[PDB]
């Protein structure tokens, strides 16, 4: 993967030149983002299990998904989906801290659609769940940091679907 700083460095290195103001301004922008992103990461790592818990409780919990027949049925499948959401939250925080979504594609969306298709996972149900984590994390962290977390989670959902 690569953070926003590394993206700027790569764009400069492609031309093999030094960083100019057209990259200086974006570096300042990312640095100003900075403490906001790190605080959001801190709070998410704080209540890491909690967002997953309430998101599953609001989207999939007490529904046909967790009922027999639904793919959330059986404790094994339940733990599997919870582990998947732990993946999604950890990688979303990773992308937010880095400032770039490259980690999702290089780590998350790479083959995930096909593997869920092979497993017969409900893509729409997973998308709804991840959206639940998105809004729950937004409410837990605030407006701005919630917005970055939401955009990363929505990129995850778009790639998944």
Partner 1 sequence: SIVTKSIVNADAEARYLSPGELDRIKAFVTGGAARLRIAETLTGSRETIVKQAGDRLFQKRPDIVSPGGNAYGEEMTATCLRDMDYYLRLVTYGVVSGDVTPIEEIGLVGVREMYRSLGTPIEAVAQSVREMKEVASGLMSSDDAAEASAYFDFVIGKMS
Partner 2 sequence: WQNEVRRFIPQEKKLTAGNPMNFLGMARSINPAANTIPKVSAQNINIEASVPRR
Task: Select the binding partner of residue 153 from partner 1, partner 2, its own copies, none (C-beta < 5 to 8 A, by kind).
Answer: none
CA–CA separation, 94 vs 103, rounded Å? 7
Rule CB under 8 A: say whether 28 interacts with its own copies.
no
Report the C-alpha dihedral over residues 34, 151, 157, 97, rounded to 10 degrees.
0
- Which of 122/142 has CB closer to ligand CYC? 122
CA–CA separation, 105 vs 110, rounded Å? 6
- Which of 36/61 has CB closer to ligand CYC? 61
Rule CB under 8 A: say whether 109 interacts with its own copies.
no
Rule CB under 8 A: say whether 105 interacts with partner 1.
no
- Which of 17/83 has CB closer to partner 2? 17
Joined together, the tokens standing for residue 130 give 């991840």
Rule CB under 8 A: say whether 3 interacts with partner 2.
no
Among the residue ranges 21-29, 30-38, 95-103, 118-126, the one whose residues contact its own copies (CB under 8 A): 118-126
81 assigned binding-site residue: yes
Rule CB under 8 A: say whether 2 interacts with partner 1.
yes
User: Three-state SS across 52-119?
Assistant: HHHHHHHHCCCCCCCCCCCCCCCHHHHHHHHHHHHHHHHHHHHHHHHCCCHHHHHHCCCCHHHHHHHH
């Amino acid at each position: 993967m690569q953070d926003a700083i590394t993206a700027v460095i790569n764009s400069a290195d492609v031309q093999g030149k030094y960083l100019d103001g057209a990259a200086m301004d974006k570096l300042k922008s990312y640095f100003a983002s900075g403490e906001l992103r790190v605080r959001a990461a801190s709070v998410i790592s704080a209540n890491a299990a909690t967002i997953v818990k309430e998101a599953v409780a609001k989207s999939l919990l007490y529904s046909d998904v967790t009922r027999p027949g639904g793919n959330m049925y059986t404790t094994r499948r339940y733990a599997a989906c919870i582990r998947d959401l732990d993946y999604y939250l950890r990688y979303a925080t990773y992308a937010m801290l880095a400032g770039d979504a490259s980690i999702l594609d290089e780590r998350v969306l790479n083959g995930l659609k096909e593997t869920y298709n092979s497993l017969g996972v409900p893509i729409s149900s997973t998308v709804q769940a991840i959206q639940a984590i998105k809004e729950v994390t937004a409410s837990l962290v605030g407006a701005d940091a919630g917005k970055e977390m939401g955009v990363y989670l929505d990129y995850i959902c778009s790639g998944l679907s």
